[PDB]
Design a binder for this molecule. Structure first.
Ligand SMILES: C[C@@H]1O[C@@H](O[C@H]2[C@H](O[C@H]3[C@H](O)[C@@H](O)[C@@H](O)O[C@@H]3CO)O[C@H](CO)[C@H](O)[C@@H]2O)[C@@H](O)[C@H](O)[C@@H]1O
Ligand SMILES: C[C@@H]1O[C@@H](O[C@H]2[C@H](O[C@H]3[C@H](O)[C@@H](O)[C@@H](O)O[C@@H]3CO)O[C@H](CO)[C@H](O)[C@@H]2O)[C@@H](O)[C@H](O)[C@@H]1O
Ligand SMILES: [Mg+2]
Ligand SMILES: [Mg+2]
Lengths: 308, 307
């Protein structure tokens, strides 16, 4: 007596990237990486179990919340003691890789910091300015409970409640490139990451991962700002609500044009929350603007996809 | 007849539908001459988006387009708008403004970013702080443009541009942040059109209930209050479900799932707003795990248990 699995009905431009808080721009299938994809945001099983650092709000993706408690004489100057994004106390002993929403790539996230005072020192006073968070930094230790910020104006920043709002990403300007498939060290140098969402890869000859791709903002230079996610944030939100039991390891899904009713191509949606297609080569898909996936049926690892 | 329902989400799992931040608390407001007519966060219970409302949380108070000119005014940089998905904006559309446009008087602060296309350094990028004043005579998003204030006027080109909002404030010249005052979407001496209607209680003893956020501010002591009628996730849910409304009012209950108890009840009106039976301004204090559940369809004259 199983509750039926389903996708939300949403066009690409009605979808949010689950790894950075921006809309999806396109679909892309990639040749198989030598190192397996293991992103930690945008991870959710088909029966609604969020994994990695994944939380439900787009506005939480690559955001931080906490208090600035110290400064050190380094480029990553301002020490931010983290809270959970909802303001509750962060417990480093929880079975998560890092606070939910933490970035899951190597590079620099740029955005703004904002503060609003509490307690006895001018409570209610506010300030905001540009900031950068480097996930290469030895002070990037979100799992332990803190990250350090680079800001624009070191003289207008207090030891007060602080929020970081991301806007874009970039390479660092000194030989530390933006690498979307390289995890940061959430507990810093010499410490292994733990409680990770598993790596994903095709397990079928002739198959490739299919990604929902965004071109996110950059703050200088020529980087394309590519961030690929496995399933969009709205699918994660939907699966969490529905909690429909998975009847096999593989759901067959069809990309449909609802006006004509025709299936354009089919894909496998795997239990742990990722898509494969039968294709060989890097390939940006060209599909109609009104197109969207629908669930067709439960299949299995024997099923051979029609060539994309 | 598909049964109506709410998504099951706690307050910290909800996004404000009028600014891209989480909900912080519930608040009920004293009825007064304050007319509520927000244009973001407007959706009927059977899933019809209204006003400037669109589905993407990251589109709320965002702009997308091209910077095409500058003028010798504070609102210096002329941004021709696209729809948030990059398609051509049509000013003849039956909307108040491009979907996502801010629906309040004030200054929105955030960042602008550019990525060049065409013959001039294609692929080159830049980003910096920017402000959009919705008081500005150049704030004419319905006509297809807004003008930006930026921090560094020497590093900004005539190129594709995105504005990402971060927070709000009063202007520094005294023009206040007024969340219930609509901008003039076509500028001076024009009338707003295609508006989602004003919202108010219609039954004695009832008050609107808001989902409230305290959003970032960029100086001073503004509390950053933005109240919405229903959160973005409810709008997204109603859009997907399209469940027929069986009457003018859906009775809903705020429940503590841990204990099973109903904390209070409220009326969810078919045009997408909530009333409760209370008198006076009141920030609700309720447990963190609480959430609304649909109870039943009732009429306009159904009497709520006082809260
Ligand atoms: C591509 C630009 O990126 C940002 O400026 C970066 C800057 O660029 C300069 C180029 O190096 C130079 O060849 C010439 O084209 O002018 C550019 C801007 O003055 O390089 C510095 C380090 O050398 C920084 O990395 C800057 O971020 C952006 O501000 C510009 O508008 C360009 O898009
Ligand atoms: C509350 C501060 O807001 C920002 O600073 C503002 C600076 O505020 C001044 C007050 O106006 C003043 O009467 C008293 O409080 O001192 C403050 C600074 O001394 O005032 C200027 C006016 O020229 C600007 O409005 C600033 O925004 C923020 O930068 C500070 O950190 C405080 O939170
Ligand atoms: Mg489906
Ligand atoms: Mg319900």
């Amino acid at each position: 007596g199983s509750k039926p699995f389903s996708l939300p009905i949403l066009t690409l431009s009605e979808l949010t990237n689950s790894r950075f808080p921006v809309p999806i721009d396109s679909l892309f299938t990639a040749q198989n990486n030598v190192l397996q994809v293991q992103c930690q945001n945008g991870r959710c099983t088909l029966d609604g179990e969020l994994q990695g650092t994944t939380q439900l709000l787009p506005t939480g993706i690559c955001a931080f919340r906490g208090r600035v408690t110290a400064q050190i004489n380094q480029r990553d100057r301002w020490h931010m003691q983290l809270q959970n994004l909802n303001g509750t106390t962060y417990d480093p002993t929880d079975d998560v890789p890092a606070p939910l929403g933490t970035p899951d790539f190597k590079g620099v996230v740029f955005g703004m910091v904002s503060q609003r005072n509490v307690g006895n020192d001018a409570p209610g006073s506010t300030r905001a300015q540009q900031a950068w968070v480097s996930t290469y930094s030895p002070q990037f230790v979100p799992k332990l409970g803190s990250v350090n910020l680079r800001i624009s104006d070191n003289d207008d920043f207090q030891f007060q409640p602080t929020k970081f709002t991301p806007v874009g990403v970039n390479d660092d300007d000194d030989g530390h490139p933006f690498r979307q498939w390289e995890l940061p060290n959430y507990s810093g140098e010499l410490t292994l990451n733990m409680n990770l969402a598993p790596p994903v890869a095709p397990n079928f000859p002739g198959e490739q991962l299919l990604f929902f791709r965004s071109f996110v903002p950059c703050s200088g230079g020529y980087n394309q700002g590519i961030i690929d996610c496995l399933i969009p944030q709205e699918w994660i939100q939907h699966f969490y609500q529905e909690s429909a039991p998975s009847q096999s390891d593989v759901a067959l899904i069809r990309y449909v044009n609802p006006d004509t009713g025709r299936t354009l191509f089919e894909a496998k949606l795997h239990r742990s929350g990722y898509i494969t297609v039968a294709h060989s080569g890097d390939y940006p898909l060209v599909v109609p603007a009104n197109g969207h996936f629908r669930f067709d049926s439960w299949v299995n690892q024997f099923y051979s996809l029609a060539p994309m």
